[PDB]
Amino acid sequence: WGSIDQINGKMNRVIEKFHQIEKEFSEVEGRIQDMEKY
Amino acid sequence: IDQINGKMNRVIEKFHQIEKEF
Amino acid sequence: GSIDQINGKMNRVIEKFHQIEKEFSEVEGRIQDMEKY
Numbered sequence: 001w002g003s004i005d006q007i008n009g010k011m012n013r014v015i016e017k018f019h020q021i022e023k024e025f026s027e028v029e030g031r032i033q034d035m036e037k038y
Numbered sequence: 039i040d041q042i043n044g045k046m047n048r049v050i051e052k053f054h055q056i057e058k059e060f
Numbered sequence: 061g062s063i064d065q066i067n068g069k070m071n072r073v074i075e076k077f078h079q080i081e082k083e084f085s086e087v088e089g090r091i092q093d094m095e096k097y
Contacts, residue, residue: 001042007094008045010087011053014080018056021076028069035062050091060084 001039003094004042004046007087007091008042008049010090011049014084014087015049015052015056017083018059018080021073021080022059024069024076025073028066028073031062031066031069035066053087057084057088060081
């Protein structure tokens, strides 16, 4: 099960970094929005 | 262990939807 | 100002999206293979 524990870890890290990339994109979006509105 | 497959099917859940989000 | 800044940030975000795609495909592949064999 060290092979499962290991893919559990690989899936967790893919998920964590997607959430970081998602947040970064949100911030970019919100600044396109500032520029467009203000 | 039932415990690490328990997790897997759970972690695998969030992974699958992110697949979709990707 | 804010225009070249967004342009830089967005390009770097897109770069990081392409990295995460490849990593996902590789993790998925490994899960598929564990389940198949």
